[PDB]
Structure formats: C-alpha cells, structure tokens
Amino acid sequence: ADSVNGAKIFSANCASCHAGGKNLVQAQKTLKKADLEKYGMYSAEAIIAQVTNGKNAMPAFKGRLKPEQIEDVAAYVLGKADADWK
Numbered sequence: 001a002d003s004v005n006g007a008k009i010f011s012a013n014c015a016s017c018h019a020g021g022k023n024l025v026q027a028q029k030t031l032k033k034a035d036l037e038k039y040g041m042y043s044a045e046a047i048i049a050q051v052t053n054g055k056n057a058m059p060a061f062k063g064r065l066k067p068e069q070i071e072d073v074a075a076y077v078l079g080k081a082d083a084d085w086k
C-alpha cells in the first residue's frame with residue numbers, strides 16, 4: 001500500500017465528511033485511532049471492506065475508486081490515525 005497516494009485519495013474523496021478525522025454525518029464514528037479500535041475498524045482489511053462496500057450512510061466506493069486506490073486510502077487512514085488523529 002502507498003499512504004502518500006492514499007492521502008491524495010483521501011483529500012479528493014473523504015474529507016467532505018472526515019476532515020480532521022471527524023465524521024460530519026455520524027458524529028461518534030470518527031477516524032481517530034481510539035474510535036477505530038473501539039469499532040473493530042483499526043486494520044487494513046476492515047477499512048478496505050467498508051470503503052469498498054459502504055456501511056449505512058458511509059458511501060461505497062467500489063467502481064468509483066480502483067482497488068489499489070482503496071487499499072492506499074486505507075493505509076492512509078491507518079497511518080494518520082496512528083500519527084495525528086489520536
């Protein structure tokens with residue numbers, strides 16, 4: 001995975017709702033490490049699944065983003081949560 005490419009994908013596709021690791025639609029489901037851990041979402045597998053297929057009001061990105069781009073954005077989230085958002 002490529003977290004740098006991931007940051008590009010995040011900026012273009014995710015920051016509308018998750019700027020600063022928040023969640024503008026469903027406020028407690030943030031991208032902070034502690035919340036990812038709490039919800040079982042602190043892994044590449046988990047983030048890829050949810051980005052790909054969606055969850056409730058979290059959009060699915062299958063088709064929109066290529067599989068590699070989904071992998072890279074997952075890497076970005078994990079890295080950013082580790083470094084800055086928690």
Ligand code: HEC
Pocket residue numbers: 009010013014015016017018023025026028029030031032035036039041047050051055056057058059061073074077
């Ligand atoms: C609004 C239109 C959103 C956009 C754009 C993106 N996300 Fe999202 N995300 C959104 C919601 C409403 C939710 C909660 C879903 C639920 O009901 O549980 C989410 C959740 C996530 C999570 C998990 C967070 C956690 O459990 O604490 C992740 C990892 C996530 N979203 C990632 C993510 C990425 C990488 C995005 C762009 C490709 C993205 N989201 C866009 C709302 C919206």
